[PDB]
Subunit: 176 residues, 2 copies
C-alpha cells in the first residue's frame, strides 16, 4: 500500500510506501476518516491496535485510511471497512469535505493529512481484524460527543477536531 | 520487584515476583491507587505506556503500584510517584481504603487486588518516566468525572470504579481547592 503525496494546492505529486510514510517528519498526504453507525443509529467507536505506527491503542472514530492512486474516497472507505472491520456499508456520505490536520502522537509519530470525512451505515455484522483494531464499542453518538467535549485527550486528536466542527457535528447528528 | 500475596480474608501469606504474578490467573495481592492534584487543584491523569503488561496505552488516574516487603502503603505511593512521574507529594490521604477489584485486560492479563486508594498534592515539577507513562494531562476534576460518565469504556476500569465511589469522589473534590 501507499500514500499519495500532495502539494500545497492539494495536487497529487507522487507516492510513498505507507509504513515508510509515517515518521516524525510526515509529509502532507491524502487520507479519509469515516464514522459508522448501525441500523439502530449507534456509533461504532474503535480502539487502534497496539501495533499501529501512529496513535496505537487510541480510541477514535470508526475507520480511517489512505486512498490509493485513482481510488475514490468512497471506495477507500468501503475497502478499509472491509479490511479493518469485515463490514459491509451503505454508500458513504460527505460530512466534512475540507478537513485537514497535522498532529504528533505520544511517540513522536506525525500524521499530516488532507482528510475528507464521511459517514455510513453498516449492513452486516462486524468481523474484527485484530491487526488494526484491539477493541471497539457501540454507543450513542450523544454520549461520545459528551466525552469528547469533556475529556478530548482520551480520544484521537482528529476525532476531536472532526466532532467539534459545527457542520460535521450537525451532520453526524442525523445518522442516529 | 514483587507483590504481596493475600488470602481469602485480606491477610498476607507471602510474596511473588511481580511480572510472573500478573497472568491469566493472577492471585490476590496488595496494591495501591493514587489521585494527584497540583497546587491549583487540577487532577493529573496519565496514560499507561505501551510496554506495561496490563492495560497498556490506557488512560487512567495518576499512579498505581505495588507495595513491597517492609513498605507501608503510603511509602509505596511516594516511591511510585517518584519512579513513574518524578514527582514529590504531600502525605497521601486515604480516600477509599476498602477498594478491591478483579478485572481482565484487553489481552487477557488479570489484575486481582486489594487496592486502597489515596489522594495527594504534588509539590514539585513532573519528570515523566517514559517506560511507565506515555502521556498525561492536567485537568479539571469535573471534566474528568463527566468524561467517565459519558464514555466509561475509554478509561481504565479501576479509575472508573474509584471515581464513582461517593466517598472517594468527595475527597477527590476536596483536592480541587487552590492551595498555595
Ligand atoms: Mg485505518
Ligand atoms: Mg504503576
Ligand atoms: Mn497518514
Ligand atoms: Mn497487581
Amino acid at each position: 500500500e501507499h500514500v499519495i503525496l500532495l502539494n500545497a494546492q492539494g495536487v497529487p505529486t507522487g507516492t510513498l510506501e505507507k509504513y515508510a510514510a509515517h515518521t516524525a517528519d510526515t509529509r502532507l498526504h491524502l487520507a479519509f476518516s469515516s464514522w459508522l453507525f448501525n441500523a439502530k443509529g449507534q456509533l461504532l467507536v474503535t480502539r487502534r491496535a497496539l501495533s499501529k505506527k501512529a496513535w496505537p491503542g487510541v480510541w477514535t472514530n470508526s475507520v480511517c485510511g489512505h486512498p490509493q492512486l485513482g481510488e475514490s474516497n468512497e471506495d477507500a472507505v468501503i475497502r478499509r471497512c472491509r479490511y479493518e472491520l469485515g463490514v459491509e456499508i451503505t454508500p458513504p456520505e460527505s460530512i466534512y469535505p475540507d478537513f485537514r490536520y497535522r498532529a504528533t502522537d505520544p511517540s513522536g509519530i506525525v500524521e499530516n493529512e488532507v482528510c475528507p470525512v464521511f459517514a455510513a451505515r453498516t449492513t452486516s455484522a462486524l468481523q474484527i481484524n485484530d491487526d488494526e483494531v484491539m477493541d471497539y464499542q457501540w454507543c450513542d453518538l450523544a454520549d461520545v460527543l459528551h466525552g469528547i467535549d469533556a475529556t478530548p485527550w482520551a480520544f484521537s486528536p482528529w476525532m476531536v477536531m472532526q466532532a467539534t466542527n459545527r457542520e460535521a457535528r450537525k451532520r453526524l447528528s442525523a445518522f442516529t
